[PDB]
C-alpha cells in the first residue's frame, strides 16, 4: 500500500479494480471475446463428426509425424483439428462418424511437439478408445 489515510478507501478500491483489470487471466476470464473465439464455448467436452484423416509433423527437435483428424463441432460448426491420442487408433476411427472430443490439458493451447492442435478424441461412435485399445469391448458395425 502507498496511499495510507484513514478516509481513503474509494481510491484504493478503484486503483485495485483497475490494476486487477489490467491482467491476463482475469482479463481472459471476464471478457466475452475469448469465449466468442472459443470453439467449445466454455465447455469441457464437445461432439463432432469426422471430415478426413490428415497428418502433421512434429517440431524441430523431435522427428515424427503425428496423425490428427479433422472434426468440425456440432454446436456451432467450427472446423477444428483434433489429435487421435494413442497408437494404432486411426484404424478404429472412420470418415463421417461421430466422435467425442475434449481438450488436451493446457486450457486451450498446444502441448509439446504437436503444432497448433490442442484437442484429443476420447470416444468414437459412442464407445471409448480405451475399450478398443485394451481388448475389453468391440465397436459396432
Amino acid at each position: 500500500g502507498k496511499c495510507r489515510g484513514l478516509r481513503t478507501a474509494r481510491k484504493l478500491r478503484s486503483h485495485r479494480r483497475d490494476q486487477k483489470w489490467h491482467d491476463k487471466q482475469y482479463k481472459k476470464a471476464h471478457l466475452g471475446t475469448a469465449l466468442k473465439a472459443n470453439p467449445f464455448g466454455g465447455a469441457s467436452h464437445a461432439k463432432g463428426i469426422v471430415l478426413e484423416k490428415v497428418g502433421v509433423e512434429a517440431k524441430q527437435p523431435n522427428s515424427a509425424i503425428r496423425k490428427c483428424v479433422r472434426v468440425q463441432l456440432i454446436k456451432n460448426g467450427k472446423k477444428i483439428t483434433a489429435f487421435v491420442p494413442n497408437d494404432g487408433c486411426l484404424n478404429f476411427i472412420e470418415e463421417n462418424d461421430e466422435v467425442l472430443v475434449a481438450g488436451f490439458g493446457r486450457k486451450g493451447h498446444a502441448v509439446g511437439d504437436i503444432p497448433g492442435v490442442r484437442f484429443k478424441v476420447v470416444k468414437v461412435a459412442n464407445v471409448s478408445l480405451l475399450a478398443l485399445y485394451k481388448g475389453k469391448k468391440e465397436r459396432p458395425r
Binding site: 497428418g55 497408437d87 484404424n91
Partner: protein, 57 residues
C-alpha cells in the same frame, strides 16, 4: 519396411506372449500386514545406502 504411413507397426509386430497363471494377491487388510512385515520386521541393519525393493543389479 513396406510403408511409413502404416500405423501400429510395433503393436502389430510385437511377439505376443500370453500371461502365465500366478497365485492371487492378498488385498484389503492383509497386504498392509505383508508390507509392514517385509519393510519393518525381518530387516537387517545395513550400512552405506539402502537398496530399493526392485534393485535387481
Amino acid at each position: 519396411h513396406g510403408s511409413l504411413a502404416r500405423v501400429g507397426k510395433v503393436r502389430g509386430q510385437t511377439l505376443k506372449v500370453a500371461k502365465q497363471e500366478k497365485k492371487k494377491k492378498r488385498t484389503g487388510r492383509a497386504k498392509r500386514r505383508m508390507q509392514y512385515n517385509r519393510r519393518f520386521v525381518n530387516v537387517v541393519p545395513t550400512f552405506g545406502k539402502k537398496k530399493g525393493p526392485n534393485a535387481n543389479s
